[PDB]
Amino acid sequence: FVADVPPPKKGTDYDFYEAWGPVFEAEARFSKKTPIPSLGNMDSSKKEVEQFYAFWHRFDSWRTFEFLDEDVPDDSSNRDHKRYIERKNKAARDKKKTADMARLVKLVERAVSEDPRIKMFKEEEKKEKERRKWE
């Protein structure tokens, strides 16, 4: 199957790439979209880093949450039974998918907040704006 890698433990010391690279690599195996950009390296360009986080901000997963599906009968004498349990199952899966999406949103937010390149990119932009003097 596809293995899961938890995020690095908040509040410990670690290299940003050593810690988060394996997390995104594992999460990305569930992508319905390719190509799949890499977290990258210390020298990735601002545009590459923007593209990486854009992919995640639009992530579309095929991860299934079908473990708690009720069995759907094909032979019920109640004609509505089959579609009813399909819809009840799907509602449960959808709730879990919604949670999974929310989980990923928070994971990505965390990574953005720790990305050392973004800190430098924001410093560079700040100096650009100051030079431009549009206020």
Side-chain angles (χ1 to χ4, degrees):
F1 190 48
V2 171
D4 298 312
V5 178
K9 192 174 174 88
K10 204 174 305 189
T12 54
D13 299 321
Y14 48 81
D15 178 279
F16 173 80
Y17 308 98
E18 292 293 335
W20 287 99
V23 172
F24 285 112
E25 184 186 45
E27 297 284 344
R29 292 174 75 189
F30 289 107
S31 182
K32 295 174 151 190
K33 303 172 184 300
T34 47
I36 292 163
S38 149
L39 181 62
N41 294 335
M42 168 176 285
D43 66 343
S44 294
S45 70
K46 191 175 70 179
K47 182 172 306 203
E48 287 178 336
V49 175
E50 285 176 348
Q51 288 161 5
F52 170 78
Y53 287 113
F55 170 90
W56 282 99
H57 288 154
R58 291 193 291 272
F59 199 67
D60 182 34
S61 184
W62 56 265
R63 186 189 294 262
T64 65
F65 310 85
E66 61 177 278
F67 180 73
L68 290 202
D69 283 356
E70 289 189 58
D71 176 81
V72 181
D74 291 323
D75 66 338
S76 176
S77 307
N78 185 321
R79 298 203 78 206
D80 291 342
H81 196 166
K82 177 170 182 176
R83 186 174 175 184
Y84 187 84
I85 300 301
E86 287 170 346
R87 284 288 297 277
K88 189 171 170 186
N89 286 343
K90 184 172 183 294
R93 293 195 310 270
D94 284 349
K95 189 164 294 200
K96 277 201 186 73
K97 186 169 173 189
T98 294
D100 185 60
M101 293 178 68
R103 174 193 64 93
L104 279 175
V105 166
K106 286 206 114 60
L107 193 164
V108 171
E109 281 181 18
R110 181 164 170 209
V112 166
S113 82
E114 298 175 27
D115 191 320
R117 307 164 293 192
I118 288 184
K119 287 188 177 55
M120 295 181 85
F121 296 150
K122 289 171 61 184
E123 167 61 19
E124 293 154 16
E125 292 180 344
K126 181 179 197 302
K127 290 300 169 206
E128 289 168 10
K129 298 286 190 191
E130 288 171 2
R131 278 193 293 285
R132 184 174 71 180
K133 292 179 62 55
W134 285 3
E135 55 280 330

